[PDB]
Design a protein around this motif. Structure first.
Motif, PDB file in Angstrom:
ATOM      1  N   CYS A 156     -33.245  36.336 -27.800  1.00 30.33           N
ATOM      2  CA  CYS A 156     -32.683  35.962 -28.998  1.00 30.33           C
ATOM      3  C   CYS A 156     -33.586  35.443 -29.999  1.00 30.33           C
ATOM      4  O   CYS A 156     -34.290  34.472 -29.817  1.00 30.33           O
ATOM      5  CB  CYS A 156     -31.518  34.523 -28.870  1.00 30.33           C
ATOM      6  N   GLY A 158     -34.590  34.951 -34.648  1.00 32.47           N
ATOM      7  CA  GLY A 158     -33.554  34.893 -35.992  1.00 32.47           C
ATOM      8  C   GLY A 158     -32.837  33.535 -36.221  1.00 32.47           C
ATOM      9  O   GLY A 158     -32.250  33.040 -35.057  1.00 32.47           O
ATOM     10  N   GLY A 160     -29.657  31.517 -37.267  1.00 37.74           N
ATOM     11  CA  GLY A 160     -28.309  31.855 -37.074  1.00 37.74           C
ATOM     12  C   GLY A 160     -27.912  32.361 -35.832  1.00 37.74           C
ATOM     13  O   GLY A 160     -26.676  32.723 -35.609  1.00 37.74           O
ATOM     14  N   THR A 162     -26.548  32.704 -32.245  1.00 29.54           N
ATOM     15  CA  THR A 162     -25.761  31.897 -31.183  1.00 29.54           C
ATOM     16  C   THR A 162     -25.890  32.538 -30.104  1.00 29.54           C
ATOM     17  O   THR A 162     -25.243  32.024 -29.094  1.00 29.54           O
ATOM     18  CB  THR A 162     -24.445  31.560 -31.796  1.00 29.54           C
ATOM     19  N   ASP A 165     -27.083  30.375 -26.900  1.00 30.83           N
ATOM     20  CA  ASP A 165     -26.894  28.873 -27.046  1.00 30.83           C
ATOM     21  C   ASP A 165     -26.524  28.426 -25.574  1.00 30.83           C
ATOM     22  O   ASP A 165     -25.699  29.126 -24.934  1.00 30.83           O
ATOM     23  CB  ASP A 165     -25.715  28.760 -28.083  1.00 30.83           C
ATOM     24  N   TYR A 209     -38.427  32.865 -29.993  1.00 29.93           N
ATOM     25  CA  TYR A 209     -37.145  33.396 -29.161  1.00 29.93           C
ATOM     26  C   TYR A 209     -36.663  32.591 -27.917  1.00 29.93           C
ATOM     27  O   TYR A 209     -37.645  32.108 -27.148  1.00 29.93           O
ATOM     28  CB  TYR A 209     -37.648  34.736 -28.996  1.00 29.93           C
TER      29      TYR A 209
HETATM   30  C1  LIG Z   1     -34.827  30.151 -36.755  1.00 31.36           C
HETATM   31  C2  LIG Z   1     -35.829  29.927 -35.612  1.00 31.36           C
HETATM   32  O1  LIG Z   1     -36.287  30.558 -34.926  1.00 31.36           O
HETATM   33  N1  LIG Z   1     -36.221  28.520 -35.775  1.00 31.36           N
HETATM   34  C3  LIG Z   1     -37.364  28.224 -34.794  1.00 31.36           C
HETATM   35  C4  LIG Z   1     -39.051  28.307 -35.428  1.00 31.36           C
HETATM   36  O2  LIG Z   1     -39.139  29.523 -35.665  1.00 31.36           O
HETATM   37  C5  LIG Z   1     -40.217  30.124 -36.367  1.00 31.36           C
HETATM   38  C6  LIG Z   1     -41.608  29.781 -35.734  1.00 31.36           C
HETATM   39  O3  LIG Z   1     -41.702  30.448 -34.500  1.00 31.36           O
HETATM   40  C7  LIG Z   1     -42.737  30.010 -36.714  1.00 31.36           C
HETATM   41  C8  LIG Z   1     -44.130  29.886 -36.082  1.00 31.36           C
HETATM   42  O4  LIG Z   1     -45.380  29.899 -37.138  1.00 31.36           O
HETATM   43  O5  LIG Z   1     -42.464  31.331 -37.224  1.00 31.36           O
HETATM   44  C9  LIG Z   1     -41.456  31.883 -37.627  1.00 31.36           C
HETATM   45  O6  LIG Z   1     -41.204  33.106 -37.950  1.00 31.36           O
HETATM   46  C10 LIG Z   1     -41.977  33.554 -39.046  1.00 31.36           C
HETATM   47  C11 LIG Z   1     -43.285  34.344 -38.346  1.00 31.36           C
HETATM   48  O7  LIG Z   1     -44.328  33.437 -37.962  1.00 31.36           O
HETATM   49  C12 LIG Z   1     -44.079  35.352 -39.292  1.00 31.36           C
HETATM   50  O8  LIG Z   1     -45.152  36.165 -38.663  1.00 31.36           O
HETATM   51  C13 LIG Z   1     -43.103  36.101 -39.920  1.00 31.36           C
HETATM   52  O9  LIG Z   1     -43.784  37.228 -40.823  1.00 31.36           O
HETATM   53  O10 LIG Z   1     -42.035  35.500 -40.657  1.00 31.36           O
HETATM   54  C14 LIG Z   1     -41.152  34.713 -39.710  1.00 31.36           C
HETATM   55  C15 LIG Z   1     -40.050  34.049 -40.457  1.00 31.36           C
HETATM   56  O11 LIG Z   1     -39.602  34.901 -41.510  1.00 31.36           O
HETATM   57  C16 LIG Z   1     -40.168  31.463 -36.760  1.00 31.36           C
HETATM   58  O12 LIG Z   1     -39.081  31.536 -37.358  1.00 31.36           O
HETATM   59  O13 LIG Z   1     -39.844  27.778 -34.479  1.00 31.36           O
HETATM   60  C17 LIG Z   1     -39.596  26.487 -34.085  1.00 31.36           C
HETATM   61  C18 LIG Z   1     -40.805  25.699 -33.300  1.00 31.36           C
HETATM   62  O14 LIG Z   1     -41.192  26.519 -32.133  1.00 31.36           O
HETATM   63  C19 LIG Z   1     -38.282  26.130 -33.264  1.00 31.36           C
HETATM   64  O15 LIG Z   1     -37.865  24.781 -32.834  1.00 31.36           O
HETATM   65  C20 LIG Z   1     -38.325  24.264 -31.395  1.00 31.36           C
HETATM   66  O16 LIG Z   1     -37.240  24.690 -30.351  1.00 31.36           O
HETATM   67  C21 LIG Z   1     -35.920  24.248 -30.751  1.00 31.36           C
HETATM   68  C22 LIG Z   1     -34.877  24.594 -29.955  1.00 31.36           C
HETATM   69  C23 LIG Z   1     -36.018  23.002 -31.265  1.00 31.36           C
HETATM   70  O17 LIG Z   1     -35.605  21.978 -29.927  1.00 31.36           O
HETATM   71  C24 LIG Z   1     -37.294  22.291 -31.891  1.00 31.36           C
HETATM   72  O18 LIG Z   1     -37.492  20.803 -31.969  1.00 31.36           O
HETATM   73  C25 LIG Z   1     -38.549  23.050 -31.285  1.00 31.36           C
HETATM   74  O19 LIG Z   1     -39.700  22.615 -31.953  1.00 31.36           O
HETATM   75  C26 LIG Z   1     -37.100  26.639 -34.420  1.00 31.36           C
HETATM   76  O20 LIG Z   1     -35.851  26.586 -33.540  1.00 31.36           O
HETATM   77  C27 LIG Z   1     -34.826  26.313 -34.212  1.00 31.36           C
HETATM   78  O21 LIG Z   1     -34.971  24.848 -34.298  1.00 31.36           O
HETATM   79  C28 LIG Z   1     -33.556  24.147 -35.034  1.00 31.36           C
HETATM   80  C29 LIG Z   1     -34.127  22.630 -35.533  1.00 31.36           C
HETATM   81  O22 LIG Z   1     -34.941  22.273 -36.604  1.00 31.36           O
HETATM   82  C30 LIG Z   1     -32.423  24.280 -34.279  1.00 31.36           C
HETATM   83  O23 LIG Z   1     -32.706  23.431 -33.183  1.00 31.36           O
HETATM   84  C31 LIG Z   1     -32.286  25.623 -33.749  1.00 31.36           C
HETATM   85  O24 LIG Z   1     -31.041  25.591 -32.857  1.00 31.36           O
HETATM   86  C32 LIG Z   1     -29.961  25.206 -33.587  1.00 31.36           C
HETATM   87  O25 LIG Z   1     -29.546  25.987 -34.670  1.00 31.36           O
HETATM   88  C33 LIG Z   1     -29.670  27.420 -34.380  1.00 31.36           C
HETATM   89  C34 LIG Z   1     -29.566  28.260 -35.705  1.00 31.36           C
HETATM   90  O26 LIG Z   1     -30.799  28.822 -35.690  1.00 31.36           O
HETATM   91  C35 LIG Z   1     -28.610  27.688 -33.122  1.00 31.36           C
HETATM   92  O27 LIG Z   1     -27.140  28.110 -34.071  1.00 31.36           O
HETATM   93  C36 LIG Z   1     -28.363  26.888 -32.160  1.00 31.36           C
HETATM   94  O28 LIG Z   1     -26.889  26.630 -31.771  1.00 31.36           O
HETATM   95  C37 LIG Z   1     -28.551  25.462 -32.598  1.00 31.36           C
HETATM   96  O29 LIG Z   1     -28.576  24.702 -31.272  1.00 31.36           O
HETATM   97  C38 LIG Z   1     -33.608  26.515 -33.507  1.00 31.36           C
HETATM   98  O30 LIG Z   1     -33.136  27.922 -33.399  1.00 31.36           O
HETATM   99  C39 LIG Z   1     -32.542  28.374 -31.844  1.00 31.36           C
HETATM  100  O31 LIG Z   1     -33.791  28.734 -30.951  1.00 31.36           O
HETATM  101  C40 LIG Z   1     -34.830  29.582 -31.298  1.00 31.36           C
HETATM  102  C41 LIG Z   1     -35.909  29.412 -30.114  1.00 31.36           C
HETATM  103  C42 LIG Z   1     -34.227  30.913 -31.492  1.00 31.36           C
HETATM  104  O32 LIG Z   1     -33.941  31.577 -30.455  1.00 31.36           O
HETATM  105  C43 LIG Z   1     -33.166  31.125 -32.743  1.00 31.36           C
HETATM  106  O33 LIG Z   1     -32.765  32.301 -32.689  1.00 31.36           O
HETATM  107  C44 LIG Z   1     -32.166  29.930 -32.267  1.00 31.36           C
HETATM  108  O34 LIG Z   1     -31.097  29.936 -32.989  1.00 31.36           O
END
Ligand SMILES: CC(=O)N[C@H]1[C@H](O[C@H]2[C@@H](O)[C@@H](CO)O[C@@H](O[C@H]3[C@H](O)[C@@H](O)[C@H](O)O[C@@H]3CO)[C@@H]2O)O[C@H](CO)[C@@H](O[C@@H]2O[C@@H](C)[C@@H](O)[C@@H](O)[C@@H]2O)[C@@H]1O[C@@H]1O[C@H](CO)[C@H](O)[C@H](O[C@H]2O[C@H](CO)[C@H](O)[C@H](O)[C@H]2O)[C@H]1O[C@@H]1O[C@@H](C)[C@@H](O)[C@@H](O)[C@@H]1O
Lengths: 417, 114
Positions: A156, A158, A160, A162, A165, A209
Motif C-alpha cells: 500500500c 499513497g 489516503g 486504507t 491498516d 509503503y
Molecule cells: C502518505 C504517506 O505515505 N506518508 C508517509 C511518508 O511518505 C513520504 C516519504 O516516503 C517521502 C520520503 O522522502 O516521499 C514521499 O513521496 C514522494 C517521493 O519521495 C518523490 O520521489 C515523488 O516524486 O513524490 C512523492 C510524493 O508526491 C512519501 O509520500 O513517509 C513518512 C516517513 O517515512 C511516513 O511516516 C512514517 O510511518 C508512519 C506509519 C508513522 O508512524 C510516522 O511517524 C513514520 O515516520 C508517512 O506515513 C503516514 O504518516 C502519517 C502521520 O503523519 C499517518 O500516520 C499515516 O497513517 C494514517 O493515515 C493514513 C492516510 O494516509 C491511513 O488512513 C491510516 O489509517 C492512518 O493510520 C501514514 O500513512 C500510511 O502508512 C504509509 C507507510 C503508507 O502505506 C500510506 O499509504 C498509509 O496510509
C-alpha cells in the motif's frame, strides 16, 4: 413369452445368467472392481478422475492468467473511490510484471467498473492457494487429509490508502511497523493457522509503503477443497463483473473491451466443469462405503443359490455404478472445453489464449513470470491430452465395471421374490 | 449417434482382414475411439483404442498383429488384422470410449482351418 425363444435372440444374456450363478465368476468380478477403484481414486497419471479434476482447476486459473493484466481495480477498504491509492498484489500476472497494480483512482468500484480491493483480496487468496498446490502436485483423490503452506505479500502506498491498516487484521493501533497477529481461520471445514504481519518500508528516493505478509499454515489440498477455491475464483470474477480493456500480428481478443462477465460461454463452461468434478469426487465416498473384498459363496457349505445367498448384490451394484459415473463425468469435463468441438468466439478464446503459454522455456506448473499475461500458462492442452490417454488405457476396466454392474443387477432382480 | 461396422468374413488361419467403422461426428469428433469383439459363449471383450491425436494401444491378446487407425477428416475407424487364428473368431464392434449407450450391428469375422 418364454426364456428359450428369448435366448435365441439375445445370446449374450444366456452367458450373463450363467456367470450370475457361478461364485468363481462373481468373485472375479469383485476382484476387478477392487482394482479399477484403485486406478480411479488411488492413481494420478493413469486416472481419468484425476486428470478431470486437474483440468477443471487449470481452466479456472488459466482464465485469470489470460485476463487479469487488463482488469480495472482500485479504491479503498470501504469499497469507495480513492484519491491517491496504489495497492500492489505480488505474484500475479500483470503487464510485463509478476505483480498486479490496482491504482484506478476517482472512479467508483463496482459492476462495469473497477474491482474493489475487498473482491481482489478474495480473488488473490484463492489464486495463491491454487498455484501453490499446482506447483507441489495434486494428490490422488483418496488422499483427502493433506495440507500445504501458503504465503503471499501485497503493498500500500499513497496518502489516503486504507487497504493495509492494522485494524483490518486485528493488529494493535500502533504496530503497523512490526506488528503481527496469529489466528485460526476456517477453510473447507478444517482449521488453519494464519499469521498476518505488517512492516513499513521507506526506500531511498521514492514513496513509503506498507507491506503485508500472509502466512497460511495447514491449508487443505484435497480435491474437494481445491475445487472450492477454483469456484471462489471464477465466481468472484463473475459476480463483481469489472471492466477490462486489452492491448491486442497474432491472436485476436473478442470482445476487446467491456465487462468480464460478458465472456458468458467461457464462464458457464468453467462453472460446469467445476460442478461436474465436484460430483465426480463425491462418488469416492460411495466406492469406499461399499468395499468388495469379502468373498462370496453358498452357506452351511451348500451350493450357491442366486435367489437367496446374494444380499451383497445391492452393494456391488452401487460400487460399480459409481465407478461408471466417475468415468462418464471425467469424460464430460473434457468435452466441455476441448477445442475440437467448439465454434465461434469461444473456440478462438481457447486455442488463441487459454491453451497457450508465453512463459519462457515450459517451466513448472504454478509459476508466474513477466510474460505470463494474456496466455493461460496452466497446462490446459497437455491435461486434455492426458485425460484422453488415461481414458484409452481404461478400455478393459470399463468393460469389467459394466460386467459387474450387469451381474449385480441380475442378482438383485432374482432376489425380489 | 450411429455406428456402422463392415469388412468381415470367412478366412483361413494366418490370413488377413480390414474392418471399417463409420461413425457420426457427434460420437467421433474429439473422442477416444476403439474396437471390441464378442466370441461365442462370452461377453464383449475390449480389443484396441486410439486417441484423437492418433496414439494407439492394444489388448495383450492381439498386440503385434492388429493395427488400429483413424481418419479425422472422414469420421472413419479402421482395424487391420494379420496372422489370424481361430481364437480371433467373433462379432467385431466399434464405439467411442467411454461407450455410447447404443451399439451398432457389428461385423462377423470367422477363422477356420477349412
Ligand atoms: C502518505 C504517506 O505515505 N506518508 C508517509 C511518508 O511518505 C513520504 C516519504 O516516503 C517521502 C520520503 O522522502 O516521499 C514521499 O513521496 C514522494 C517521493 O519521495 C518523490 O520521489 C515523488 O516524486 O513524490 C512523492 C510524493 O508526491 C512519501 O509520500 O513517509 C513518512 C516517513 O517515512 C511516513 O511516516 C512514517 O510511518 C508512519 C506509519 C508513522 O508512524 C510516522 O511517524 C513514520 O515516520 C508517512 O506515513 C503516514 O504518516 C502519517 C502521520 O503523519 C499517518 O500516520 C499515516 O497513517 C494514517 O493515515 C493514513 C492516510 O494516509 C491511513 O488512513 C491510516 O489509517 C492512518 O493510520 C501514514 O500513512 C500510511 O502508512 C504509509 C507507510 C503508507 O502505506 C500510506 O499509504 C498509509 O496510509
Amino acid at each position: 413369452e418364454n426364456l428359450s425363444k428369448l435366448l435365441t435372440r439375445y445370446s449374450t444374456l444366456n452367458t450373463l445368467i450363467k456367470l450370475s450363478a457361478d461364485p468363481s465368476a462373481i468373485n472375479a468380478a469383485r476382484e476387478n472392481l477392487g482394482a479399477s477403484a484403485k486406478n480411479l481414486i488411488g492413481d494420478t497419471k493413469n486416472s481419468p478422475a484425476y486428470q478431470a479434476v486437474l483440468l477443471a482447476i487449470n481452466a479456472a486459473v488459466g482464465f485469470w492468467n489470460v485476463l487479469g493484466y487488463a482488469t480495472q481495480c482500485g479504491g479503498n477498504a470501504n469499497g469507495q473511490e480513492s484519491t491517491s491509492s496504489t495497492t500492489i498484489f505480488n505474484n500475479e500476472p500483470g503487464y510485463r510484471s509478476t505483480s498486479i497494480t490496482c491504482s484506478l483512482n476517482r472512479y467508483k468500484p463496482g459492476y462495469y467498473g473497477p474491482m474493489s480491493i475487498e473482491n481482489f483480496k478474495k480473488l488473490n487468496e484463492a489464486y495463491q492457494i491454487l498455484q501453490t498446490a499446482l506447483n507441489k502436485g495434486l494428490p490422488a483423490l483418496k488422499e483427502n487429509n493433506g495440507t500445504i503452506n501458503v504465503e503471499y505479500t501485497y503493498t500500500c502506498s499513497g496518502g489516503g490508502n486504507t487497504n493495509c491498516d492494522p485494524s483490518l487484521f486485528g493488529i494493535g493501533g500502533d504496530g503497523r511497523n512490526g506488528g503481527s497477529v496469529t489466528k485460526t481461520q476456517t477453510i473447507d471445514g478444517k482449521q488453519v493457522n494464519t499469521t498476518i504481519s505488517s512492516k513499513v518500508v521507506q526506500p531511498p528516493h521514492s514513496a513509503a509503503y506498507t507491506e503485508i505478509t500472509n502466512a497460511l499454515n495447514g491449508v487443505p489440498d484435497s480435491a474437494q477443497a481445491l475445487l472450492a477455491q477454483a469456484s471462489t475464483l471464477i465466481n468472484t470474477i463473475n459476480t463483481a463483473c469489472p471492466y477490462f480493456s486489452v492491448t491486442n500480428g497474432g491472436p485476436q481478443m473478442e470482445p476487446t473491451r467491456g465487462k468480464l462477465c460478458g465472456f458468458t460461454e467461457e464462464i458457464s463452461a468453467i462453472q460446469k466443469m467445476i460442478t461436474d468434478a465436484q460430483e465426480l469426487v463425491n462418488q469416492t465416498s460411495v466406492i469406499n462405503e461399499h468395499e468388495q473384498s469379502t468373498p462370496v459363496g453358498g452357506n452351511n457349505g451348500k451350493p450357491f443359490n442366486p435367489f437367496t445367498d446374494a444380499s451383497f448384490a445391492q452393494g456391488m451394484l452401487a460400487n460399480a455404478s459409481a465407478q461408471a459415473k466417475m468415468l462418464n463425468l471425467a469424460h464430460q469435463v473434457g468435452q466441455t472445453i476441448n477445442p475440437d468441438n467448439l465454434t465461434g468466439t469461444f473456440k478462438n478464446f481457447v486455442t488463441g489464449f487459454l491453451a497457450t503459454c508465453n512463459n519462457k522455456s515450459g517451466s513448472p506448473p504454478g509459476t508466474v513470470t513477466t510474460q505470463t499475461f494474456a496466455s493461460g500458462c496452466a497446462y490446459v492442452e497437455q491435461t486434455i491430452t492426458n485425460l484422453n490417454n488415461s481414458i484409452a488405457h481404461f478400455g478393459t476396466q470399463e468393460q469389467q465395471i459394466q460386467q459387474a454392474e450387469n451381474i449385480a443387477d441380475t442378482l438383485v432382480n432374482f432376489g425380489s421374490h | 449417434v450411429q455406428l456402422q461396422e463392415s469388412g468381415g468374413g470367412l478366412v483361413q488361419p494366418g490370413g488377413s482382414l480390414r474392418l471399417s467403422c463409420a461413425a457420426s461426428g457427434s460420437i467421433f469428433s474429439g473422442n477416444v475411439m476403439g474396437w471390441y469383439r464378442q466370441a461365442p459363449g462370452k461377453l464383449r471383450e475390449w480389443v484396441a483404442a486410439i486417441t484423437p491425436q492418433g496414439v494407439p494401444n492394444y489388448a495383450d491378446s492381439v498386440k503385434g498383429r492388429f493395427t488400429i487407425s483413424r481418419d479425422n477428416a472422414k469420421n472413419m475407424l479402421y482395424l487391420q488384422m494379420s496372422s489370424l487364428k481361430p481364437e480371433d473368431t467373433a462379432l467385431y464392434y466399434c464405439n467411442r470410449l467411454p461407450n455410447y449407450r447404443s451399439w451398432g450391428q457389428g461385423t462377423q469375422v470367422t477363422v477356420s482351418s477349412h
